[PDB]
Short mmCIF file of C-alpha atoms in Angstrom, two decimals:
data_model
loop_
_atom_site.label_atom_id
_atom_site.label_comp_id
_atom_site.label_asym_id
_atom_site.label_seq_id
_atom_site.Cartn_x
_atom_site.Cartn_y
_atom_site.Cartn_z
CA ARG A 1 31.00 -14.05 43.35
CA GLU A 2 27.86 -12.54 41.86
CA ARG A 3 28.53 -8.96 42.93
CA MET A 4 30.75 -8.32 39.93
CA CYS A 5 29.05 -10.40 37.28
CA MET A 6 25.48 -9.25 37.20
CA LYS A 7 25.79 -5.91 35.41
CA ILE A 8 27.45 -7.41 32.42
CA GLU A 9 24.78 -9.53 30.75
CA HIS A 10 22.35 -6.64 31.02
CA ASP A 11 24.80 -4.75 28.83
CA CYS A 12 25.80 -7.52 26.54
CA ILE A 13 23.04 -10.04 25.90
CA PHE A 14 20.49 -10.15 23.17
CA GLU A 15 18.74 -13.38 22.29
CA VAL A 16 17.15 -14.96 19.25
CA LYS A 17 13.51 -15.28 18.30
CA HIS A 18 11.67 -17.59 15.93
CA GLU A 19 7.87 -17.54 15.82
CA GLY A 20 7.64 -15.42 18.96
CA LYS A 21 9.54 -17.97 21.03
CA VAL A 22 13.05 -17.51 22.42
CA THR A 23 15.43 -20.46 22.23
CA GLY A 24 19.02 -19.25 22.07
CA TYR A 25 21.11 -16.26 23.10
CA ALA A 26 23.52 -13.85 21.49
CA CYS A 27 26.60 -11.93 22.51
CA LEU A 28 28.54 -8.88 21.41
CA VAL A 29 32.26 -9.23 21.97
CA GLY A 30 35.11 -6.93 21.07
CA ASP A 31 34.56 -5.89 17.49
CA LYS A 32 32.43 -8.71 16.07
CA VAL A 33 28.97 -9.81 17.10
CA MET A 34 28.49 -13.44 17.90
CA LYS A 35 25.88 -16.08 17.25
CA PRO A 36 26.00 -19.86 17.56
CA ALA A 37 24.35 -20.83 14.33
CA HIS A 38 22.92 -24.13 15.62
CA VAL A 39 19.54 -22.66 16.51
CA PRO A 40 17.24 -21.17 13.87
CA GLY A 41 15.75 -17.75 14.43
CA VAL A 42 16.04 -14.00 14.13
CA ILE A 43 17.66 -11.63 16.63
CA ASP A 44 15.21 -9.58 18.67
CA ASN A 45 16.23 -6.16 17.48
CA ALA A 46 15.05 -3.99 14.62
CA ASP A 47 18.04 -3.12 12.55
CA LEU A 48 21.08 -5.33 12.93
CA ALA A 49 19.32 -8.37 11.51
CA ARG A 50 19.85 -6.57 8.18
CA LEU A 51 23.50 -7.53 8.31
CA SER A 52 26.00 -9.63 6.41
CA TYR A 53 26.83 -13.04 7.81
CA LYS A 54 29.64 -15.48 7.15
CA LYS A 55 28.91 -19.08 7.83
CA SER A 56 30.96 -22.24 8.12
CA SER A 57 29.16 -25.37 9.27
CA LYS A 58 32.52 -26.85 10.18
CA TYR A 59 32.44 -24.93 13.43
CA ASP A 60 28.71 -24.03 13.70
CA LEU A 61 29.40 -20.41 14.56
CA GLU A 62 28.35 -17.11 13.07
CA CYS A 63 29.71 -13.57 13.20
CA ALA A 64 29.11 -10.13 11.83
CA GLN A 65 30.60 -6.72 12.46
CA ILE A 66 28.97 -4.24 14.83
CA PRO A 67 27.80 -0.95 13.30
CA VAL A 68 29.34 2.06 14.95
CA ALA A 69 26.42 3.13 17.13
CA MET A 70 26.52 0.63 20.00
CA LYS A 71 30.11 -0.46 19.34
CA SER A 72 31.19 0.74 22.78
CA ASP A 73 29.05 -1.75 24.70
CA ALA A 74 31.05 -4.97 24.43
CA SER A 75 33.15 -6.66 27.04
CA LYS A 76 36.85 -7.24 27.38
CA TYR A 77 38.59 -10.46 26.51
CA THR A 78 41.90 -12.26 26.60
CA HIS A 79 43.48 -15.62 25.99
CA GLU A 80 45.56 -16.08 29.11
CA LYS A 81 44.04 -18.90 31.02
CA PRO A 82 45.63 -20.57 34.00
CA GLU A 83 43.59 -23.22 35.77
CA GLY A 84 41.32 -22.18 38.60
CA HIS A 85 37.87 -20.98 39.52
CA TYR A 86 35.66 -19.29 36.99
CA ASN A 87 32.07 -18.19 36.93
CA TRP A 88 28.88 -18.14 34.91
CA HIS A 89 25.15 -17.55 34.96
CA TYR A 90 24.46 -20.47 37.24
CA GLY A 91 27.36 -20.50 39.59
CA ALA A 92 31.05 -21.22 39.64
CA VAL A 93 32.92 -23.45 37.21
CA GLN A 94 36.25 -25.20 37.62
CA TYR A 95 38.75 -25.84 34.85
CA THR A 96 41.94 -27.80 34.39
CA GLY A 97 43.64 -30.17 31.98
CA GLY A 98 41.79 -28.78 29.02
CA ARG A 99 38.63 -29.94 30.76
CA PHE A 100 35.81 -27.78 32.08
CA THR A 101 33.54 -29.01 34.87
CA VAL A 102 30.41 -28.13 36.83
CA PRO A 103 28.13 -30.48 38.79
CA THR A 104 25.12 -32.32 37.51
CA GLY A 105 22.29 -31.13 35.37
CA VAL A 106 22.11 -27.44 36.19
CA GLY A 107 21.94 -26.73 32.46
CA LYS A 108 19.12 -27.44 30.03
CA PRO A 109 18.46 -27.76 26.31
CA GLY A 110 17.51 -24.41 24.90
CA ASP A 111 20.43 -22.71 26.61
CA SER A 112 23.23 -22.17 24.10
CA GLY A 113 24.93 -18.81 24.14
CA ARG A 114 26.16 -18.30 27.64
CA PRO A 115 29.50 -16.52 28.00
CA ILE A 116 31.82 -17.37 30.88
CA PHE A 117 34.20 -15.13 32.77
CA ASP A 118 37.18 -14.76 35.07
CA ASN A 119 37.42 -12.94 38.32
CA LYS A 120 39.07 -9.77 37.13
CA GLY A 121 36.60 -8.97 34.41
CA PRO A 122 37.27 -9.96 30.75
CA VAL A 123 35.07 -12.48 28.99
CA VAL A 124 36.61 -15.83 28.21
CA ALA A 125 34.63 -18.24 26.07
CA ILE A 126 31.26 -19.57 25.04
CA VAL A 127 29.29 -22.78 25.54
CA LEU A 128 27.41 -25.14 23.20
CA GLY A 129 25.83 -28.21 24.86
CA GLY A 130 26.24 -30.92 27.49
CA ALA A 131 27.45 -34.45 28.15
CA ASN A 132 26.54 -37.02 30.80
CA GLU A 133 29.05 -37.68 33.51
CA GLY A 134 27.75 -39.34 36.61
CA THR A 135 28.52 -36.42 38.96
CA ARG A 136 30.28 -33.35 37.51
CA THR A 137 29.40 -32.46 33.95
CA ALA A 138 31.34 -32.16 30.73
CA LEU A 139 31.01 -29.06 28.64
CA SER A 140 31.22 -28.11 24.97
CA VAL A 141 33.02 -24.84 24.39
CA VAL A 142 34.79 -23.03 21.57
CA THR A 143 37.81 -20.92 22.50
CA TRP A 144 40.87 -19.02 21.36
CA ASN A 145 44.61 -19.24 20.91
CA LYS A 146 46.82 -16.20 20.77
CA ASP A 147 45.82 -16.22 17.14
CA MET A 148 43.27 -18.84 16.27
CA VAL A 149 39.84 -20.14 17.27
CA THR A 150 39.35 -23.76 18.22
CA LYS A 151 36.59 -26.21 19.02
CA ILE A 152 36.89 -28.98 21.56
CA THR A 153 34.22 -31.66 21.76
CA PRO A 154 34.61 -34.54 24.19
CA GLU A 155 33.01 -37.90 23.59
CA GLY A 156 29.43 -38.73 24.37
CA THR A 157 27.76 -35.37 24.21
CA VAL A 158 24.44 -33.99 23.08
CA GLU A 159 24.18 -30.85 21.04
CA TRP A 160 21.93 -28.49 22.91
CA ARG B 1 6.82 25.91 35.28
CA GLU B 2 6.70 22.17 34.65
CA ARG B 3 3.65 21.46 36.82
CA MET B 4 1.27 22.42 34.02
CA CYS B 5 3.16 21.21 30.98
CA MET B 6 3.90 17.59 31.60
CA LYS B 7 0.51 15.99 31.02
CA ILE B 8 0.19 17.39 27.56
CA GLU B 9 2.83 15.59 25.51
CA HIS B 10 1.66 12.29 26.95
CA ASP B 11 -1.67 13.09 25.32
CA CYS B 12 -0.43 14.62 22.16
CA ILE B 13 2.86 13.15 20.95
CA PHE B 14 3.48 10.35 18.56
CA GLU B 15 6.81 10.01 16.80
CA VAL B 16 8.12 8.60 13.55
CA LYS B 17 9.91 5.35 12.86
CA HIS B 18 12.13 4.19 10.02
CA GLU B 19 13.90 0.84 10.26
CA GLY B 20 13.04 0.45 13.94
CA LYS B 21 14.78 3.70 14.85
CA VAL B 22 13.05 6.88 16.02
CA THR B 23 14.32 10.19 14.64
CA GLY B 24 11.52 12.75 14.59
CA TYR B 25 8.28 13.51 16.39
CA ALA B 26 4.68 14.19 15.48
CA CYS B 27 1.83 16.28 16.82
CA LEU B 28 -1.93 16.39 16.66
CA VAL B 29 -3.30 19.91 16.74
CA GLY B 30 -6.84 21.19 16.44
CA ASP B 31 -8.36 19.41 13.47
CA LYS B 32 -5.33 18.46 11.38
CA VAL B 33 -2.47 16.16 12.27
CA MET B 34 1.01 17.50 11.83
CA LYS B 35 4.31 16.22 10.56
CA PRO B 36 7.49 18.03 9.57
CA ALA B 37 8.28 16.25 6.35
CA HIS B 38 12.06 16.74 6.57
CA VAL B 39 12.70 13.38 8.19
CA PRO B 40 11.89 10.11 6.41
CA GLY B 41 9.90 7.46 8.22
CA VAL B 42 6.54 6.02 9.17
CA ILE B 43 4.41 6.99 12.17
CA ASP B 44 4.42 4.45 14.98
CA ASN B 45 0.75 3.58 14.93
CA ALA B 46 -1.22 0.94 13.09
CA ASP B 47 -3.93 2.68 11.18
CA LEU B 48 -3.46 6.38 10.53
CA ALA B 49 -0.42 5.82 8.33
CA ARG B 50 -3.05 4.73 5.76
CA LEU B 51 -3.97 8.35 5.25
CA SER B 52 -3.92 10.99 2.56
CA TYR B 53 -1.11 13.52 2.64
CA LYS B 54 -0.60 16.86 0.97
CA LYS B 55 2.94 17.95 0.46
CA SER B 56 4.66 21.16 -0.51
CA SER B 57 8.45 21.22 -0.33
CA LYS B 58 8.29 25.00 -0.26
CA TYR B 59 7.55 24.86 3.44
CA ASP B 60 8.68 21.29 4.31
CA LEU B 61 5.54 20.52 6.28
CA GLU B 62 2.90 17.83 6.08
CA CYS B 63 -0.68 17.52 7.28
CA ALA B 64 -3.62 15.18 7.20
CA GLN B 65 -7.03 15.15 8.81
CA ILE B 66 -7.70 13.21 12.01
CA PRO B 67 -10.28 10.42 11.79
CA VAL B 68 -13.12 10.83 14.21
CA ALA B 69 -12.04 8.34 16.86
CA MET B 70 -9.27 10.19 18.70
CA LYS B 71 -10.27 13.62 17.42
CA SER B 72 -10.91 14.86 20.95
CA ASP B 73 -7.30 14.52 22.10
CA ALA B 74 -5.64 17.59 20.59
CA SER B 75 -4.58 20.76 22.29
CA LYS B 76 -5.80 24.32 22.10
CA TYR B 77 -4.18 27.02 20.05
CA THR B 78 -4.25 30.70 19.24
CA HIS B 79 -2.36 33.39 17.41
CA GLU B 80 -2.19 36.13 20.00
CA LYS B 81 1.39 36.47 20.98
CA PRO B 82 2.79 39.28 23.07
CA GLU B 83 6.44 39.06 24.01
CA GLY B 84 7.40 37.30 27.21
CA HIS B 85 8.30 34.00 28.77
CA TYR B 86 7.31 30.74 27.15
CA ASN B 87 8.12 27.13 27.78
CA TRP B 88 9.11 23.86 26.17
CA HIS B 89 10.43 20.37 26.74
CA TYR B 90 13.79 21.57 27.95
CA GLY B 91 13.01 24.65 29.89
CA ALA B 92 11.83 28.19 29.38
CA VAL B 93 12.17 30.22 26.20
CA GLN B 94 12.13 33.96 25.70
CA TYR B 95 10.74 35.77 22.68
CA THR B 96 10.72 39.29 21.31
CA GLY B 97 11.26 41.22 18.12
CA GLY B 98 10.23 38.32 15.97
CA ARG B 99 13.18 36.48 17.47
CA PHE B 100 13.08 33.40 19.68
CA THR B 101 15.93 32.61 22.07
CA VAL B 102 17.21 29.96 24.48
CA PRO B 103 20.79 29.46 25.71
CA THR B 104 23.45 27.33 24.16
CA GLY B 105 23.28 23.85 22.79
CA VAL B 106 20.49 22.29 24.81
CA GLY B 107 19.03 20.97 21.57
CA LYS B 108 20.37 18.25 19.29
CA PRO B 109 20.00 16.94 15.75
CA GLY B 110 17.30 14.33 15.64
CA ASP B 111 14.90 16.54 17.57
CA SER B 112 12.44 18.15 15.15
CA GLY B 113 8.83 18.19 16.18
CA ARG B 114 8.70 19.86 19.53
CA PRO B 115 5.67 22.08 20.18
CA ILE B 116 6.00 25.14 22.40
CA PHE B 117 3.46 26.69 24.72
CA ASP B 118 2.30 29.66 26.75
CA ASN B 119 1.49 29.84 30.39
CA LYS B 120 -2.27 29.62 30.20
CA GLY B 121 -2.43 26.49 28.13
CA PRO B 122 -2.86 26.65 24.30
CA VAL B 123 -0.14 25.41 21.99
CA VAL B 124 1.71 28.02 20.01
CA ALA B 125 4.14 26.84 17.36
CA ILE B 126 6.62 24.24 16.23
CA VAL B 127 10.39 24.03 15.78
CA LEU B 128 12.67 22.87 12.96
CA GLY B 129 16.43 23.21 13.61
CA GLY B 130 19.17 25.36 15.13
CA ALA B 131 21.71 28.09 14.46
CA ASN B 132 24.97 29.03 16.16
CA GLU B 133 25.00 32.14 18.26
CA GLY B 134 27.81 32.45 20.72
CA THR B 135 25.60 32.41 23.84
CA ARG B 136 21.81 32.27 23.37
CA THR B 137 20.58 30.29 20.41
CA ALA B 138 18.57 31.09 17.32
CA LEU B 139 15.59 28.97 16.43
CA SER B 140 13.77 27.88 13.29
CA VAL B 141 10.00 27.90 13.69
CA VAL B 142 6.91 27.99 11.51
CA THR B 143 3.92 29.92 12.83
CA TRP B 144 0.55 31.50 12.14
CA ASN B 145 -1.19 34.75 11.33
CA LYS B 146 -4.84 35.32 12.04
CA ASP B 147 -5.26 33.60 8.71
CA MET B 148 -2.06 32.32 7.22
CA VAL B 149 0.94 30.13 8.02
CA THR B 150 4.46 31.49 7.73
CA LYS B 151 8.05 30.34 7.90
CA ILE B 152 10.87 32.40 9.32
CA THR B 153 14.45 31.28 8.83
CA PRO B 154 17.29 33.43 10.11
CA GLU B 155 20.72 33.35 8.55
CA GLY B 156 23.36 30.78 9.31
CA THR B 157 21.32 27.83 10.43
CA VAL B 158 21.48 24.08 10.11
CA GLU B 159 18.46 22.01 9.29
CA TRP B 160 18.06 19.47 12.02
CA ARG C 1 -24.89 27.04 39.02
CA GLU C 2 -28.52 25.95 39.11
CA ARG C 3 -29.75 28.66 41.47
CA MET C 4 -30.13 31.15 38.63
CA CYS C 5 -31.23 28.90 35.80
CA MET C 6 -34.24 27.06 37.06
CA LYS C 7 -36.92 29.75 36.91
CA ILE C 8 -36.37 30.40 33.26
CA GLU C 9 -37.58 27.27 31.49
CA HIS C 10 -40.76 27.37 33.56
CA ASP C 11 -41.38 30.74 31.93
CA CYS C 12 -40.15 29.96 28.49
CA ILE C 13 -40.70 26.35 27.46
CA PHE C 14 -43.56 24.80 25.62
CA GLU C 15 -43.15 21.49 23.84
CA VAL C 16 -44.65 19.71 20.87
CA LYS C 17 -47.24 16.96 20.74
CA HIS C 18 -48.14 14.41 18.09
CA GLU C 19 -50.65 11.67 18.89
CA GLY C 20 -50.59 12.47 22.60
CA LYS C 21 -46.85 11.87 22.83
CA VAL C 22 -44.22 14.56 23.45
CA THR C 23 -41.00 14.37 21.43
CA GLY C 24 -39.52 17.84 21.00
CA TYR C 25 -39.50 21.20 22.74
CA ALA C 26 -40.18 24.80 21.84
CA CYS C 27 -38.89 28.20 22.87
CA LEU C 28 -40.01 31.79 22.81
CA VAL C 29 -37.15 34.21 22.29
CA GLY C 30 -37.15 37.97 21.87
CA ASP C 31 -39.84 38.76 19.34
CA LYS C 32 -40.16 35.53 17.36
CA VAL C 33 -41.22 32.11 18.56
CA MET C 34 -38.95 29.23 17.76
CA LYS C 35 -39.34 25.66 16.64
CA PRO C 36 -36.83 23.19 15.22
CA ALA C 37 -38.84 21.79 12.37
CA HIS C 38 -37.15 18.37 12.36
CA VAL C 39 -39.76 16.74 14.56
CA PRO C 40 -43.39 16.42 13.44
CA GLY C 41 -46.14 17.51 15.78
CA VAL C 42 -48.37 20.27 17.11
CA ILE C 43 -47.58 22.67 19.94
CA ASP C 44 -49.42 21.94 23.18
CA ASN C 45 -51.39 25.14 23.41
CA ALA C 46 -54.82 26.12 22.16
CA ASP C 47 -54.42 29.18 20.05
CA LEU C 48 -50.96 29.89 18.71
CA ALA C 49 -50.92 26.78 16.55
CA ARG C 50 -53.25 28.85 14.33
CA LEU C 51 -50.28 30.86 13.18
CA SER C 52 -48.30 31.58 10.04
CA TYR C 53 -45.05 29.73 9.56
CA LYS C 54 -42.09 30.26 7.27
CA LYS C 55 -40.06 27.23 6.45
CA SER C 56 -36.71 26.60 4.83
CA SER C 57 -35.42 23.03 4.88
CA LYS C 58 -31.94 24.38 4.24
CA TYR C 59 -31.62 25.14 7.93
CA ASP C 60 -34.41 22.96 9.41
CA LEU C 61 -35.75 25.75 11.59
CA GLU C 62 -39.13 27.39 11.99
CA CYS C 63 -40.33 30.71 13.35
CA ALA C 64 -43.44 32.76 13.81
CA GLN C 65 -44.25 36.02 15.51
CA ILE C 66 -45.67 36.13 19.03
CA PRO C 67 -49.13 37.68 19.43
CA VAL C 68 -49.19 40.57 21.83
CA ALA C 69 -50.66 38.83 24.86
CA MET C 70 -47.72 36.84 26.23
CA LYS C 71 -45.09 38.84 24.36
CA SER C 72 -43.48 39.94 27.62
CA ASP C 73 -42.43 36.44 28.68
CA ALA C 74 -39.34 35.80 26.57
CA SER C 75 -35.73 35.85 27.62
CA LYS C 76 -32.85 38.13 26.81
CA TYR C 77 -30.20 37.40 24.23
CA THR C 78 -26.96 38.62 22.76
CA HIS C 79 -24.20 37.63 20.40
CA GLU C 80 -21.12 38.40 22.42
CA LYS C 81 -19.48 35.14 23.20
CA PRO C 82 -16.04 34.77 24.68
CA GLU C 83 -14.90 31.26 25.51
CA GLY C 84 -15.64 29.88 28.95
CA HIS C 85 -18.13 28.03 31.07
CA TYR C 86 -21.77 27.88 30.12
CA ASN C 87 -24.75 25.98 31.38
CA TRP C 88 -27.78 23.97 30.38
CA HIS C 89 -30.50 21.62 31.54
CA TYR C 90 -28.09 18.85 32.39
CA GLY C 91 -25.11 20.62 33.75
CA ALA C 92 -22.29 22.85 32.63
CA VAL C 93 -20.90 23.08 29.11
CA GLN C 94 -17.52 24.30 27.93
CA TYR C 95 -16.85 26.11 24.67
CA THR C 96 -13.84 27.21 22.68
CA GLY C 97 -12.47 27.23 19.16
CA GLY C 98 -15.90 27.22 17.62
CA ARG C 99 -16.40 23.88 19.35
CA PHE C 100 -18.87 23.06 22.09
CA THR C 101 -18.25 20.17 24.49
CA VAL C 102 -19.85 18.18 27.30
CA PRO C 103 -18.96 14.67 28.49
CA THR C 104 -20.38 11.42 27.27
CA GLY C 105 -23.93 10.44 26.58
CA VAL C 106 -25.89 12.64 28.95
CA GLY C 107 -28.19 13.52 26.06
CA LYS C 108 -30.72 11.32 24.29
CA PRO C 109 -32.71 11.16 21.07
CA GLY C 110 -36.02 12.89 21.53
CA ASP C 111 -34.37 15.91 23.10
CA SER C 112 -34.10 18.69 20.52
CA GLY C 113 -35.02 22.16 21.64
CA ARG C 114 -32.88 22.90 24.62
CA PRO C 115 -31.65 26.49 24.95
CA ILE C 116 -28.29 27.21 26.55
CA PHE C 117 -27.22 30.18 28.63
CA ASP C 118 -24.45 32.28 30.10
CA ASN C 119 -23.85 33.20 33.67
CA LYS C 120 -25.27 36.69 33.66
CA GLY C 121 -28.63 35.80 32.21
CA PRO C 122 -29.34 36.15 28.44
CA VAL C 123 -30.05 33.12 26.30
CA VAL C 124 -27.42 32.13 23.81
CA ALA C 125 -28.24 29.38 21.34
CA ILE C 126 -30.08 26.17 20.63
CA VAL C 127 -29.17 22.52 20.11
CA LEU C 128 -30.06 19.91 17.47
CA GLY C 129 -28.42 16.48 17.92
CA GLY C 130 -25.27 14.60 18.92
CA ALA C 131 -22.05 13.05 17.66
CA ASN C 132 -19.83 10.30 19.04
CA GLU C 133 -16.53 11.32 20.52
CA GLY C 134 -14.89 8.82 22.79
CA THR C 135 -15.05 10.99 25.93
CA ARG C 136 -16.46 14.53 25.63
CA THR C 137 -19.25 14.98 23.13
CA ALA C 138 -19.72 17.06 20.02
CA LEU C 139 -22.80 19.18 19.64
CA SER C 140 -24.99 20.48 16.82
CA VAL C 141 -26.09 24.06 17.34
CA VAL C 142 -27.39 26.96 15.29
CA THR C 143 -26.30 30.45 16.33
CA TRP C 144 -26.02 34.12 15.48
CA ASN C 145 -23.71 36.78 14.13
CA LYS C 146 -24.20 40.44 14.85
CA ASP C 147 -26.56 40.21 11.91
CA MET C 148 -27.01 36.72 10.58
CA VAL C 149 -27.95 33.20 11.67
CA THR C 150 -25.62 30.30 11.01
CA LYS C 151 -25.52 26.53 11.27
CA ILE C 152 -22.45 24.55 12.18
CA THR C 153 -22.44 20.79 11.79
CA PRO C 154 -19.31 18.81 12.54
CA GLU C 155 -18.58 15.49 10.91
CA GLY C 156 -19.99 12.20 12.04
CA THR C 157 -23.17 13.23 13.76
CA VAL C 158 -26.67 11.87 14.15
CA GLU C 159 -29.70 14.06 13.82
CA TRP C 160 -31.68 13.70 17.00
#
C-alpha cells in the first residue's frame, strides 16, 4: 500500500515558509498550482512566488498557473469516486456516504495540504483540518464535480 | 583523462544567479576574476559582488581583482600552445590550425563559462557559444598572446 | 634535499648585532657583500664593519666590496630560472608565474637575510618579509635580470 505512493510526493510537494519555519504544504496539480490560503507564509522556492494569485475567502483556497518549465511534473486526477479504500501520508482512509474516515488523532495542527489518492494512481482531493469523533475521525476536504469545485464541512470541527 | 581534471573546478568555479536561477558560470584565474558579461545576473557569493568592474562590449568580457583572502585558489596558466589533445568538462577536445573541434551537440545554451585545459595542468582558455557543423563542432573562444587578449569568432555561430 | 645544502651557510653566513642581540643576517655573494638595510645593527666581525657603504632607501638594500682575504668564500650564482622546486633553510619552496610560495607561517619576524638555492648549487635570491595567504604564503624577494636588480612586492605584506 506504500509501494506505489512514495515516489509521488517527492515529485509534487513544496511547502510554505514564514520566518524560517514551515507550517503548511503546497501541491502542483494538472495545470494550476495549489495552495490552501489559511496559513500565512511564502513558498520555499526562488521564482514562482513572483506570481499572480486569485483569492476568494469564501472557500479559503488559492491557485496560480504553472510556468512552462516544470509543467510536466504534476500528477493525474479524476472525479470518478466509488466508495472504498484510499490512501494517504499516514495510512489508509475509508470513504462512503459523502463521509471520509480515519481513526483517532493521527493528524496534527500544522498539517494542511496533504493530497489523497486512489489505488490506480491519480490524485483525488485535499484536506483542511479535523473534527473530534470518539473513535474514527471526521475530515475537512474540498473536492470536485465533473465541472465544479465544492467544500464540505461537517459540524464540530477545528480549522487546522 | 579525468583523473587529473576533476579536483580543479571544485576549487575554481563559482556561477551566476539571477532570480534564483543559474545560467552562466564564473572563473578565478591568476590575479583577476573572470566573468563573460553576456549573461545577466549576480555571482552566488556574499561579498565579492561588491566589487569594481570594467566593461567593454567590444569583447563581451568582464574582470575584477581578487581580494587577498582567497587569492591563493586560482589555477595556473600559460600561452604556449602546440596542437594536440586537450580536455574539458565533457570530454576531450582537439585543436589545430587556429580551429578548435569537438563532435556534435554535446554542449547546450546556458553553458558559457567553461575553462579548458592541457595535460600538464595550467588553464588555457574560455568558451562562449557554438556553431553548426555537420559532424564536429566549431567553438567560440577568447584567448591570449604573449601580451594581448584576442577574440576569434568563426562564421555562422550562435551566441550561447 | 638537505644533504647538499647544509655546508653552505656555515661558509657564507654572518649576522648582525645591535646591543648584544642578533636580529638579521648577512650574506657574501660573488664579489660584493650583502646586507638588507632594514634592520639596524653592526656585523659581528672585527674588521669589515670599517667599510664603505652605498645606500638607497628606494630598494632597502646595502652592499660593499669584499677585501681580498676571504674573497674566495662566496657562493655561485646565476639568473636562469625555470619554474620548479627550490630549497631554503626551512624546507622546499615552489615557484611559478613570478610568484614564490611555501605553506603557512614557518617564517617569523626577525628573519630577514635568508638566501635561497637551486638543486645544482648556485645561490639564487634573497628574502625580505611575509604576507598572509590563508594556506600557502606569499614572499618578498629581490632578484636579478641578466643585467639589472629588481624588487617585487605583492599586496598586503608586512615588512619583517
